[PDB]
Amino acid sequence: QCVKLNDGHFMPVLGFGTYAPPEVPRSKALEVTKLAIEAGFRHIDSAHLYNNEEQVGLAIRSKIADGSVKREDIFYTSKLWSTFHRPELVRPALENSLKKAQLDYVDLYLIHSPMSLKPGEELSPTDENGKVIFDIVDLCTTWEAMEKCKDAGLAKSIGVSNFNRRQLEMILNKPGLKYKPVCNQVECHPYFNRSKLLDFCKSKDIVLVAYSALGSQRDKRWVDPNSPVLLEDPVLCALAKKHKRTPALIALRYQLQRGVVVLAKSYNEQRIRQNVQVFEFQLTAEDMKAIDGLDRNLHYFNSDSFASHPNYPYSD
Ligand SMILES: NC(=O)c1ccc[n+]([C@@H]2O[C@H](COP(=O)([O-])OP(=O)(O)OC[C@H]3O[C@@H](n4cnc5c(N)ncnc54)[C@H](OP(=O)(O)O)[C@@H]3O)[C@@H](O)[C@H]2O)c1
Question: How many structural domains are present in the chain?
């Protein structure tokens, strides 16, 4: 099923995550995105950062060309990268995304992060200490340029990602605001459930979309390998046995029952098909309370590389 966004458009509540690290061959994104659509995913999440929009777009268009779906059945997301926050670069950046995917529009365009970076060749310009070279950009001006992309029909809906409550309030309080963010895509899982940010988002009819809902890919660039493995959690395992599902399915269903839209990345055929089974069962109030009890303020993304950024959303 879908949730109705605050601009009247509809978003499927289960989304497929397409990010894989650069060591994974680019051709895999094509294969697995087709498999996801074939399994029943209709919401597909990409970004300029992922260097896979050519492949993800081809997977979508291939499933259109092969008769499986129409463009109107797919909900396709991309994101403005942080080197393009200056308002004059927003539309060009979006047009690159459209060119790569060979699509006329995205269903959703997000500001990927509030942590603006120096414009240039690199995705991630850093100094000699490894910290990313920041840019100072009024994100309200960035947002105005996002609104023009919606008016031009290049993005059906616009929203944000990795914003905390205050950063979000800055947008909502902007003089002359035309379109509220339809969503805030943020790290969200039983060890970092974001319930306060969720309550705030609910109060403004903004959808919280969860990433790393399965514990993240635990990439050594950003994630401490000593951090607890979400999917090995004894409570999630006990609930999996109770319901004859898996820890992953429990973690996904938890988000759906909280009114959270949830992403799920898998590049494995069997797990991709497993993940759509989230619609086949329910958790009880007691199950949900047990999962709510797991919250431990654990953001997996935890690196020096962004912890010193002025717009770093977390308070550590
Ligand atoms: N806006 C942002 O800053 C941002 C940040 C992070 C992520 N995202 C988006 O959200 C997506 C998902 O988040 P994520 O990349 O952190 O990964 P994730 O959804 O939390 O998944 C983590 C891992 O779980 C495994 N997995 C999936 N299904 C499973 C199952 N049924 N049983 C056991 N393991 C399973 C996957 O490995 P296998 O591939 O081997 O199955 C995957 O590597 C990303 O792909 C991206 O689209 C956005």
Answer: 1
